[PDB]
Amino acid sequence: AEYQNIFSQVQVRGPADLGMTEDVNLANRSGVGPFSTLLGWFGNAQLGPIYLGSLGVLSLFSGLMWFFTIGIWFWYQAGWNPAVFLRDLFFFSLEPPAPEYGLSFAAPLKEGGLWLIASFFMFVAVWSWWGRTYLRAQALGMGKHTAWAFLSAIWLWMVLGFIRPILMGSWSEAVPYGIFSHLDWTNNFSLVHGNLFYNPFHGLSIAFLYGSANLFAMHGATILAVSRFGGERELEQIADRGTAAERAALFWRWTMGFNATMEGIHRWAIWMAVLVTLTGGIGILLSGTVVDNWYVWGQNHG
Amino acid sequence: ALLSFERKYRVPGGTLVGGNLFDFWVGPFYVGFFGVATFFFAALGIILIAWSAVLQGTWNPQLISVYPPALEYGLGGAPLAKGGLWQIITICATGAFVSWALREVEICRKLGIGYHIPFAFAFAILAYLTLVLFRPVMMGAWGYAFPYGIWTHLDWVSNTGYTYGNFHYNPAHMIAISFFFTNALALALHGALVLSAANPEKGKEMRTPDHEDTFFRDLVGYSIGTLGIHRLGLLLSLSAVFFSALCMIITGTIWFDQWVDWWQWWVKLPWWANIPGGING
Amino acid sequence: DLASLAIYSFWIFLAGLIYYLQTENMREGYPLENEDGTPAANQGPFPLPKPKTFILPHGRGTLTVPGPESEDRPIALARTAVSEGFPHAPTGDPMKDGVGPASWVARRDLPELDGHGHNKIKPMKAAAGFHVSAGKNPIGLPVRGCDLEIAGKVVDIWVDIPEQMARFLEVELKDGSTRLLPMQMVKVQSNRVHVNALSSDLFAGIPTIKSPTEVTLLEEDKICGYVAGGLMYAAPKRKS
Ligand code: BCL
Ligand code: BCL
Ligand code: BCL
Ligand SMILES: CC[C@H]1c2cc3[nH]c4c(c3C)C(=O)[C@H](C(=O)OC)c4c3nc(cc4[nH]c(cc(n2)[C@@H]1C)c(C(C)=O)c4C)[C@@H](C)[C@@H]3CCC(=O)OC/C=C(\C)CCC[C@H](C)CCC[C@H](C)CCCC(C)C
Ligand SMILES: COC(C)(C)C/C=C/C(C)=C/C=C/C(C)=C/C=C/C(C)=C/C=C\C=C(C)\C=C\C=C(/C)CC/C=C(\C)CCC=C(C)C
Numbered sequence: 001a002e003y004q005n006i007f008s009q010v011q012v013r014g015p016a017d018l019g020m021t022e023d024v025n026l027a028n029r030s031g032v033g034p035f036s037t038l039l040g041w042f043g044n045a046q047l048g049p050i051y052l053g054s055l056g057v058l059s060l061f062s063g064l065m066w067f068f069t070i071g072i073w074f075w076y077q078a079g080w081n082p083a084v085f086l087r088d089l090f091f092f093s094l095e096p097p098a099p100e101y102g103l104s105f106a107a108p109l110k111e112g113g114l115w116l117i118a119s120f121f122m123f124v125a126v127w128s129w130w131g132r133t134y135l136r137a138q139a140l141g142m143g144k145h146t147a148w149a150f151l152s153a154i155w156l157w158m159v160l161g162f163i164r165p166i167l168m169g170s171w172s173e174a175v176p177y178g179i180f181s182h183l184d185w186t187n188n189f190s191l192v193h194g195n196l197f198y199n200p201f202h203g204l205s206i207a208f209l210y211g212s213a214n215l216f217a218m219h220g221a222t223i224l225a226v227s228r229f230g231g232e233r234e235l236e237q238i239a240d241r242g243t244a245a246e247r248a249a250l251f252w253r254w255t256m257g258f259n260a261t262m263e264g265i266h267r268w269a270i271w272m273a274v275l276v277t278l279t280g281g282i283g284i285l286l287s288g289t290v291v292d293n294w295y296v297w298g299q300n301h302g
Numbered sequence: 303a304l305l306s307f308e309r310k311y312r313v314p315g316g317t318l319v320g321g322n323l324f325d326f327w328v329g330p331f332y333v334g335f336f337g338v339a340t341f342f343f344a345a346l347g348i349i350l351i352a353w354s355a356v357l358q359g360t361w362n363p364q365l366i367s368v369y370p371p372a373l374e375y376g377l378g379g380a381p382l383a384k385g386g387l388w389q390i391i392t393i394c395a396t397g398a399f400v401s402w403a404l405r406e407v408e409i410c411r412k413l414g415i416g417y418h419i420p421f422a423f424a425f426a427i428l429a430y431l432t433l434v435l436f437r438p439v440m441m442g443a444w445g446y447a448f449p450y451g452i453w454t455h456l457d458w459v460s461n462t463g464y465t466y467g468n469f470h471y472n473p474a475h476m477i478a479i480s481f482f483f484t485n486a487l488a489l490a491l492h493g494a495l496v497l498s499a500a501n502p503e504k505g506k507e508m509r510t511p512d513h514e515d516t517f518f519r520d521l522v523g524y525s526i527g528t529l530g531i532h533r534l535g536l537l538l539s540l541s542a543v544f545f546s547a548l549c550m551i552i553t554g555t556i557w558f559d560q561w562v563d564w565w566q567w568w569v570k571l572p573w574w575a576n577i578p579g580g581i582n583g
Numbered sequence: 584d585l586a587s588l589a590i591y592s593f594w595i596f597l598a599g600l601i602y603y604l605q606t607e608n609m610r611e612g613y614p615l616e617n618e619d620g621t622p623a624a625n626q627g628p629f630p631l632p633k634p635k636t637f638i639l640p641h642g643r644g645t646l647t648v649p650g651p652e653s654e655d656r657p658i659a660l661a662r663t664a665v666s667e668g669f670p671h672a673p674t675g676d677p678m679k680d681g682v683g684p685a686s687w688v689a690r691r692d693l694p695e696l697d698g699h700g701h702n703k704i705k706p707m708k709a710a711a712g713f714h715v716s717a718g719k720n721p722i723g724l725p726v727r728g729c730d731l732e733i734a735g736k737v738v739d740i741w742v743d744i745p746e747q748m749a750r751f752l753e754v755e756l757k758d759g760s761t762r763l764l765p766m767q768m769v770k771v772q773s774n775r776v777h778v779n780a781l782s783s784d785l786f787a788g789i790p791t792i793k794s795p796t797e798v799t800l801l802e803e804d805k806i807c808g809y810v811a812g813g814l815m816y817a818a819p820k821r822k823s
């Protein structure tokens with residue numbers, strides 16, 4: 001009989017919402033996209049507008065170049081044959097230079113040079129995109145939490161593809177661009193370093209990852225459960241606590257003996273999440289640079 | 303002691319069992335019938351884990367481990383020192399978890415909120431039961447379950463996985479991981495957005511949901527909204543766990559070879575199986 | 584050993600982090616109180632954080648937290664025992680008194696404003712040009728309570744302008760006045776709207792709003808509190 005707020009029962013639409021202006025250069029917003037009723041059962045129906053600008057174009061272009069550089073090598077591996085391309089789509093792989101070439105940019109296209117090219121395009125696309133997350137907050141007068149959080153992800157990615165290869169002296173230590181091949185890289189990395197389950201930073205990463213699923217199931221469910229008192233209007237519950245915020249706190253206090261605020265829960269959140277890649281990148285960066293075998297290291301409980 | 307706004311909510315009511323008999327708090331904790339059940343099951347279980355530590359003969363927390371009956375016992379009982387304790391402790395654990403959920407339900411009732419939290423918790427319980435009850439029973443032995451020990455259960459994860467090669471190729475595992483990773487991305491963004499609106503640049507007024515919508519649209523062309531993101535977080539994390547359980551419930555039951563080899567269905571399709579070139583011709 | 588140093592440092596960092604987080608989450612509700620209002624003796628090992636100040640938009644002021652904590656309302660409950668830890672029995676009608684799961688908080692008796700300073704929530708009729716875009720339009724449908732009697736009819740939907748979502752149904756009663764029902768506590772069906780939380784006699788008891796085209800935070804809490812309170816307190820008149 002009772003309703004659950006997982007999907008809306010009634011959608012309502014008004015004029016396309018063009019957004020707050022603050023210090024944003026409006027010359028760079030698109031106009032609105034379509035409205036999707038399908039999206040609208042779960043979240044907002046409105047696609048767009050989006051902001052371009054120079055950095056956006058750079059990122060987007062640069063990111064496509066990465067993607068098409070990887071895809072040109074795949075068609076090539078397929079001898080230009082479409083049926084073979086789909087077939088072996090997950091088996092293709094753009095691999096980095098062999099160890100002989102070390103950190104040099106001298107390796108031929110077909111044996112690493114293409115990987116460096118694609119890696120270059122990716123490096124540009126991500127960092128431009130990072131700067132994008134800062135700049136769009138700045139235009140709107142908002143805190144920089146999103147760019148600080150994104151930087152945690154970037155740290156792991158940087159460690160895997162750039163920082164660890166340099167410290168180990170060779171690009172051959174980096175991750176290849178392919179679906180199956182990256183999983184093989186991953187497995188092989190654990191095996192070669194004595195099993196990552198013995199790397200305390202790996203185990204922390206995990207705790208945070210599983211922790212994030214805890215916390216978002218918890219938080220997400222809490223807000224849904226008090227959404228009949230307006231719980232999802234979190235910024236106003238912060239400025240002016242209502243029964244939604246109090247019943248939320250109290251559910252948890254009565255369940256496990258302590259509890260959050262409508263603001264502080266989001267600090268638990270930002271941190272649980274960022275600590276995944278944060279501890280994680282330390283774990284990898286140390287692997288092979290400083291510890292050759294986590295089993296061994298672990299036996300000297302240290 | 304009470305939070306400053308708590309008294310008005312501490313009324314009688316909402317119990318599922320016992321009426322007013324266990325309708326009270328102890329400090330901050332609500333009790334209830336299911337609070338008593340939880341205590342019993344957890345206390346029994348801890349006592350027994352400690353007893354098991356005495357038979358294994360250690361008190362180190364990094365060494366205590368309680369293993370299930372060996373495979374030769376099938377689905378029967380085993381003497382307490384050779385898997386039976388694990389068996390009793392698993393009943394306690396299940397008792398304690400389910401009680402914890404039903405007590406959460408009682409708290410919801412008192413507080414006049416939705417049942418989403420314990421409903422969500424129930425997915426974690428279903429994963430635990432997949433590994434310690436459902437999957438072992440379909441495989442014919444308690445011994446396919448994981449042992450209760452900090453480092454030993456990790457040993458079991460590695461051995462179980464490598465029995466099927468790289469477990470990476472279990473396709474339900476791939477999906478699960480996708481949801482775990484996506485969930486964490488979402489958590490990072492959500493926490494960061496709300497905090498960026500409530501804590502703006504020095505001197506400025508608090509931003510609004512309008513700014514949060516505007517921010518995401520600026521960055522990626524879409525905002526899912528303040529209701530939607532809570533709907534999303536719930537879904538991503540539950541979907542991760544549902545697919546976790548699915549990836550294990552099928553492993554050793556309907557699929558039991560190297561998971562890598564499963565993918566050959568695709569490669570071996572008539573339309574392109576025999577065309578040469580590529581990785582597989 | 585570098586990895587040893589890194590891990591020891593992290594555990595230290597993590598402990599500071601838990602302290603920062605725990606204390607930040609003590610900016611409401613603390614200090615702890617006895618069942619009578621007065622500061623409890625044992626506050627715990629975590630001290631209150633130094634205050635912080637939110638600047639509210641639209642001239643609405645600041646909030647500074649932690650700060651002095653009061654309910655700013657009568658609480659119609661009384662003790663049912665001689666020691667800490669039991670329930671507190673309603674002294675009147677808990678629906679009418681707004682206690683228990685009928686509770687409301689004394690929020691600011693103005694309406695939440697969008698980022699332009701306009702009321703966030705309007706009846707759809709006054710919100711240009713918002714309309715139902717999908718699903719069954721409830722407007723026109725008779726409203727049914729948990730006793731299975733018609734308590735009224737839906738005459739509008741109150742919508743959140745900037746998030747473009749339904750938030751209440753405005754319902755007209757036998758006497759011709761209206762009430763807001765939270766969107767989240769109705770099942771819209773094809774021939775009716777169903778409300779499990781309230782019997783048909785309890786609709787009139789829903790708190791009413793002072794102006795007919797806006798709703799304040801205070802009124803929202805009274806409405807939502809009252810309707811949810813129904814689950815516990817209208818469960819005698821419900822029904823199989
Ligand atoms: C999910 C798939 C695997 C599994 C794979 C892994 C891998 C891989 C890792 C762990 C790790 C952990 N696992 Mg495990 N683990 C499994 C099932 C369990 C179960 C269970 C089903 O009941 C429990 C209680 C644990 C508990 C634990 C912790 C000891 C540790 C950090 C968990 C965490 O932070 O999660 C998120 C949850 C929170 C942050 C909430 C807090 C939960 C606390 C920390 C639980 C304490 C458990 C306590 C020591 C058990 C004693 C119980 C007594 C009755 C008190 N695992 C199953 C078998 N687990 C990490 C580790 O470091 O191992 C040494 C790690 O790398
Ligand atoms: C056999 C394999 C090994 C193993 C080998 C590894 C290796 C190797 C690593 C991990 C890592 C991790 N392992 Mg492990 N791991 C094992 C078993 C496990 C088990 C388990 C058995 O239950 C679990 C739960 C985990 C869990 C984890 C995570 C905690 C951690 C990755 C965190 C993360 O968010 O990465 C995902 C997030 C990122 C990679 C960040 C990327 C961000 C960038 C910027 C995004 C760019 C996007 C790009 C431009 C594309 C754009 C397209 C868009 C559509 C626009 N491992 C076993 C032992 N594991 C990682 C780690 O940190 O180890 C410490 C890692 O390197
Ligand atoms: C070498 C090992 C294999 C591998 C072998 C396995 C095996 C085997 C399993 C997994 C499972 C998982 N793998 Mg794997 N996996 C590998 C590599 C990875 C990598 C990676 C980056 O390489 C990642 C990210 C993952 C991720 C995952 C997840 C999909 C899943 C773990 C989460 C889960 O099930 O939660 C579900 C959550 C629970 C079970 C926790 C239940 C909590 C209960 C209900 C409450 C406990 C309360 C506690 C006692 C409280 C203490 C009280 C105090 C107050 C705190 N695997 C490698 C290739 N993987 C597991 C899975 O899917 O399980 C279903 C699984 O069994
Ligand atoms: C710290 C924990 C988690 C985390 C945090 C995190 N990630 C983040 C952020 C944060 C805080 C961001 O702000 C940033 C973001 O913008 O999110 C929306 C981001 C981000 N996280 C992303 C991915 C990501 N995060 C991951 C993980 C994680 N991120 C961790 C789990 C992973 C994993 C698990 O592997 C992935 C894959 C991106 C969505 C974004 C970084 C975007 C970026 O750098 O862009 C460059 C690339 C392109 C612009 C184009 C690529 C090409 C396309 C593949 C194909 C074509 C489609 C195209 C868009 C069509 C255009 C057609 C034209 C002709 C018009
Ligand atoms: C349909 O056909 C077309 C042609 C249209 C396009 C099809 C394209 C296809 C099918 C593309 C497929 C792409 C795939 C599968 C990509 C998979 C990528 C994966 C799984 C990546 C995983 C990990 C990547 C990591 C960790 C990379 C890190 C990279 C860096 C840190 C950048 C480092 C930069 C370097 C090394 C260059 C440095 C150079 C200078 C000059 C400083």
Ligand SMILES: CCCCCCCCCCCC[N+](C)(C)[O-]
Binds near residue numbers: 007
């Ligand atoms: C994550 C975005 C995709 C959303 C797709 C979900 C569609 C399900 C719609 C359910 C229909 C609801 N109902 C019964 C009121 O019509």
Ligand SMILES: CCCCCCCCCCCC[N+](C)(C)[O-]
Binds near residue numbers: 202204
């Ligand atoms: C936001 C903070 C949340 C705190 C969660 C901490 C869980 C710690 C679990 C122990 C991990 C064990 N190991 C092997 C890494 O040492």
Ligand SMILES: CCCCCCCCCCCC[N+](C)(C)[O-]
Binds near residue numbers: 484
């Ligand atoms: C943020 C929305 C994107 C969801 C991506 C989740 C990753 C899994 C991709 C496979 C689709 C899952 N499912 C259930 C439809 O099969």
Ligand SMILES: [Fe+3]
Binds near residue numbers: 492
């Ligand atoms: Fe939230």
Ligand SMILES: [K+]
Binds near residue numbers: 707708711712713714
């Ligand atoms: K209208």
Ligand SMILES: [Mg+2]
Binds near residue numbers: 426
């Ligand atoms: Mg959990």
